[PDB]
Amino acid sequence: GTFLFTSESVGEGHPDKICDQISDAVLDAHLQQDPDAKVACETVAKTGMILLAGEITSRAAVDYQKVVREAVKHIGYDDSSKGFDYKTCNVLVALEQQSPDIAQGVHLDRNEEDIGAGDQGLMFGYATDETEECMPLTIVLAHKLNAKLAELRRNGTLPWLRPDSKTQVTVQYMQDRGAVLPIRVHTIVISVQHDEEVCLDEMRDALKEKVIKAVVPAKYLDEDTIYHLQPSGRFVIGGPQGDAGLTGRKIIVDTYGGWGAHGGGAFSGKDYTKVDRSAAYAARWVAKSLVKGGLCRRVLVQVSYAIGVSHPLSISIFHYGTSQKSERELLEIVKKNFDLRPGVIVRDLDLKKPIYQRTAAYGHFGRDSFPWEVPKKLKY
Amino acid sequence: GTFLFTSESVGEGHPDKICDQISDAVLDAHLQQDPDAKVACETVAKTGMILLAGEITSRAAVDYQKVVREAVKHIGYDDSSKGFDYKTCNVLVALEQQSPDIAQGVHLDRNEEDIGAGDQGLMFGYATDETEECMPLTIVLAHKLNAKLAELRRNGTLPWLRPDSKTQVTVQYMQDRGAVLPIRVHTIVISVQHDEEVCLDEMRDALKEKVIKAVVPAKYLDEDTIYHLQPSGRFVIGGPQGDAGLTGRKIIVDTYGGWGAHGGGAFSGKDYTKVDRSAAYAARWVAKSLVKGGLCRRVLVQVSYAIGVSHPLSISIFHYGTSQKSERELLEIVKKNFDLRPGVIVRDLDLKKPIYQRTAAYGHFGRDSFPWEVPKKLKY
Numbered sequence: 001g002t003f004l005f006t007s008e009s010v011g012e013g014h015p016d017k018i019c020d021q022i023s024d025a026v027l028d029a030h031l032q033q034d035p036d037a038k039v040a041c042e043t044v045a046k047t048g049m050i051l052l053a054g055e056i057t058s059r060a061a062v063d064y065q066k067v068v069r070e071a072v073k074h075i076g077y078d079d080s081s082k083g084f085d086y087k088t089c090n091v092l093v094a095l096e097q098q099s100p101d102i103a104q105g106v107h108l109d110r111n112e113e114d115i116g117a118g119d120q121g122l123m124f125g126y127a128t129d130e131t132e133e134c135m136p137l138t139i140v141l142a143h144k145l146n147a148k149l150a151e152l153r154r155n156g157t158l159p160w161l162r163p164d165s166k167t168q169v170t171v172q173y174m175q176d177r178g179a180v181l182p183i184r185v186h187t188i189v190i191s192v193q194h195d196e197e198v199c200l201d202e203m204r205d206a207l208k209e210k211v212i213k214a215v216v217p218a219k220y221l222d223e224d225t226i227y228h229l230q231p232s233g234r235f236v237i238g239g240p241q242g243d244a245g246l247t248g249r250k251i252i253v254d255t256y257g258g259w260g261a262h263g264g265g266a267f268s269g270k271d272y273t274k275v276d277r278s279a280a281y282a283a284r285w286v287a288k289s290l291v292k293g294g295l296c297r298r299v300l301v302q303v304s305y306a307i308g309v310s311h312p313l314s315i316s317i318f319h320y321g322t323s324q325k326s327e328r329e330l331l332e333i334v335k336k337n338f339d340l341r342p343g344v345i346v347r348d349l350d351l352k353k354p355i356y357q358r359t360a361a362y363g364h365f366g367r368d369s370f371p372w373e374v375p376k377k378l379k380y
Numbered sequence: 381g382t383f384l385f386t387s388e389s390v391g392e393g394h395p396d397k398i399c400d401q402i403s404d405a406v407l408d409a410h411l412q413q414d415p416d417a418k419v420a421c422e423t424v425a426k427t428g429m430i431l432l433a434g435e436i437t438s439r440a441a442v443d444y445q446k447v448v449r450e451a452v453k454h455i456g457y458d459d460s461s462k463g464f465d466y467k468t469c470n471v472l473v474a475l476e477q478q479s480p481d482i483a484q485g486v487h488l489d490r491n492e493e494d495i496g497a498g499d500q501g502l503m504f505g506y507a508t509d510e511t512e513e514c515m516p517l518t519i520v521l522a523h524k525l526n527a528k529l530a531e532l533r534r535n536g537t538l539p540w541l542r543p544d545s546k547t548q549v550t551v552q553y554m555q556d557r558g559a560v561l562p563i564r565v566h567t568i569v570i571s572v573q574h575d576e577e578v579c580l581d582e583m584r585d586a587l588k589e590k591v592i593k594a595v596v597p598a599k600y601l602d603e604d605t606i607y608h609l610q611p612s613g614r615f616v617i618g619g620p621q622g623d624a625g626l627t628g629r630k631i632i633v634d635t636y637g638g639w640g641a642h643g644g645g646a647f648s649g650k651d652y653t654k655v656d657r658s659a660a661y662a663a664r665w666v667a668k669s670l671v672k673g674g675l676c677r678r679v680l681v682q683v684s685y686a687i688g689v690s691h692p693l694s695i696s697i698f699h700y701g702t703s704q705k706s707e708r709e710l711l712e713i714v715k716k717n718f719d720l721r722p723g724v725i726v727r728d729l730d731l732k733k734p735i736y737q738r739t740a741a742y743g744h745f746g747r748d749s750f751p752w753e754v755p756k757k758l759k760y
């Protein structure tokens with residue numbers, strides 16, 4: 001009756017995550033001045049380079065040099081010895097206006113509530129009662145391991161740490177009438193960029209004692225748990241120098257860690273009219289509302305859109321057998337309680353607010369009581 | 381008992397797909413000369429620009445200008461009137477060697493069969509008996525609609541078509557003891573870039589009569605089917621000019637269209653040591669082998685790895701209730717019949733062969749009898 005499931009997370013300095021954070025720093029900078037900015041900002045990172053490419057139509061005056069460099073500073077890349085330095089790297093900009101053909105078909109001369117979806121696409125939300133925050137334990141633990149690394153880097157207790165990290169957690173679960181129950185941690189991987197001086201044994205001991213034991217409850221760890229700590233043996237070169245980064249290349253880290261499903265679209269760098277983001281946030285909100293409302297223990301929600309059309313083309317509910325109500329009944333409850341037009345989601349979830357950089361590391365869900373994490377009280 | 385499910389596909393000229401195809405053209409060019417090339421080539425596209433960024437260590441001598449421009453030519457962007465021209469666009473290259481720290485931890489001085497995984501990560505394979513090729517009908521139809529557009533563009537019967545397109549198909553299904561049975565097509569979306577002269581009514585009529593009816597069996601279409609054809613109303617600006625493209629931004633189009641699951645890693649531009657690709661191909665091979673072997677009607681396979689470690693850290697089988705055998709029994713069959721070390725997968729699936737550009741549009745699975753699509757006969 002038991003099975004394994006694995007999820008990963010990455011740190012703030014993983015090169016793809018750098019790009020997500022920069023893209024959302026750009027979005028936030030625009031929204032601070034123009035709440036209706038149309039933003040589709042992709043970021044690419046390689047040795048010494050941040051490139052911004054995409055489409056922005058906005059009344060804001062944004063200093064891209066400053067915004068990019070401040071984001072990199074916050075992440076911690078502040079010296080050539082670390083492989084990347086916000087003070088001295090190249091920032092290149094290839095940004096144009098939003099296509100007028102898109103604008104006319106999506107939002108021009110439309111009532112805000114009746115704005116069209118900014119694109120076609122499909123999106124999923126997911127929730128599971130296995131944690132209070134309604135997220136899979138595998139990814140929660142993986143994120144917290146990366147957060148702990150950043151904490152110990154920033155507080156100076158492990159000064160050999162650098163910002164680029166990856167973690168991976170395999171949990172053994174039991175099945176429980178469609179719900180899942182975590183039993184134990186089967187395997188943990190941690191890889192983190194480090195300075196030239198620290199030895200492998202010092203790092204592996206610190207990762208076990210000061211990172212894993214600080215994060216993972218002892219009840220989940222036992223004599224059989226497998227640890228792969230600095231498994232490559234050496235990780236001095238890191239950040240964009242070690243591996244090119246791009247926005248939207250961590251979409252499973254950003255969401256459910258392999259659980260649930262994904263429609264494919266990236267979140268970062270996009271304003272609310274891009275339903276890839278807003279409708280995925282709304283679908284999470286629906287899923288979490290169903291679980292916290294006691295209607296089911298685990299649920300997957302699909303929605304889809306066509307460019308220029310406000311109402312979703314399809315809505316689907318999959319409850320894994322964890323409700324007394326049928327999926328059809330849950331779908332009817334959802335349709336009676338939620339309006340998933342993007343021009344309504346923006347109001348319900350306050351999606352013109354410049355909080356997006358905060359979403360761009362450690363997952364978009366299960367944290368911080370963002371609006372999509374506050375369940376809606378359902379009438380049925 | 382019925383539900384809706386939606387999947388999308390994109391055409392060869394969608395800007396993200398352009399990048400996937402270029403990344404895999406670069407990979408193939410290296411593999412033609414050096415079967416052991418280490419390749420991690422990301423591509424970015426915006427108005428007038430293809431940028432290559434990443435890491436390649438190879439004995440090949442590759443003319444990146446030629447390889448990139450030939451790929452864009454094949455896609456069909458050959459004139460400024462179409463928004464992009466292989467003859468005149470900018471090709472910029474930011475390629476460095478593979479990090480020596482990665483190389484030493486993954487493959488240097490290792491027996492090929494015992495090469496480490498090139499990264500940590502998780503990967504999924506999926507198969508469903510609802511089509512002969514063991515793929516979801518929603519995405520099969522979505523891909524075929526894009527292929528039909530390209531066919532009618534290239535044969536001159538719809539000369540107003542351009543290469544950038546997106547499609548989306550919503551199917552109504554019945555549940556059948558964990559398997560799924562397609563009933564009818566509920567909604568179809570098609571958006572395709574077009575010339576300045578053709579009118580909306582001509583396009584919508586052609587898309588219904590010459591594209592949809594040519595692709596979708598009439599038995600699935602009825603008076604209730606909803607058609608969103610050129611729903612934005614105008615799509616003259618397209619390709620990278622309309623929307624920036626990046627490699628690895630169509631990972632759900634590349635795989636199962638929202639069905640199954642995804643571990644997050646992109647395929648294109650990566651040689652076999654990157655388990656994001658090779659282990660996902662192997663997991664598809666496992667899933668399809670289980671379904672074609674009669675052991676189940678629908679199955680999801682998870683595998684995961686740590687950088688530098690050859691054997692997977694976890695393997696999991698989820699059969700949706702579609703087998704008489706337990707998931708544990710299927711897992712034991714898989715473990716007895718498959719060796720999922722990357723240095724064995726490469727031999728079984730012939731992954732040094734330069735066929736990767738062929739995988740980079742219309743999905744990596746369900747087509748062309750690639751090695752991962754030829755089931756393994758299972759002993760149990």
Ligand SMILES: CSC[C@H]1O[C@@H](n2cnc3c(N)ncnc32)[C@H](O)[C@@H]1O
Nearest residue numbers: 015191232234235242243481482499
């Ligand atoms: C293996 S390259 C993909 C990711 O793995 C990490 N990485 C880079 N170099 C190493 C290394 N030497 N050892 C382990 N992980 C690494 C970085 O987070 C990078 O973005």
Ligand SMILES: CSC[C@H]1O[C@@H](n2cnc3c(N)ncnc32)[C@H](O)[C@@H]1O
Nearest residue numbers: 101102119395571612614615622623
């Ligand atoms: C809306 S931008 C995202 C994708 O949608 C497509 N697209 C671009 N412009 C339009 C348009 N005017 N109408 C419909 N789809 C478009 C292109 O495939 C692009 O990559």
Ligand SMILES: [K+]
Nearest residue numbers: 243244245420
């Ligand atoms: K990369």
Ligand SMILES: [K+]
Nearest residue numbers: 040623624625
């Ligand atoms: K884009």
Ligand SMILES: [Mg+2]
Nearest residue numbers: 016244245249
């Ligand atoms: Mg990456």
Ligand SMILES: [Mg+2]
Nearest residue numbers: 396624625629
């Ligand atoms: Mg895209």
Ligand code: NA
Nearest residue numbers: 186224225226
């Ligand atoms: Na274990």
Ligand code: NA
Nearest residue numbers: 305306309311
């Ligand atoms: Na819509």
Ligand code: NA
Nearest residue numbers: 566604605606
């Ligand atoms: Na319909």
Ligand code: NA
Nearest residue numbers: 685686689691
């Ligand atoms: Na491994």
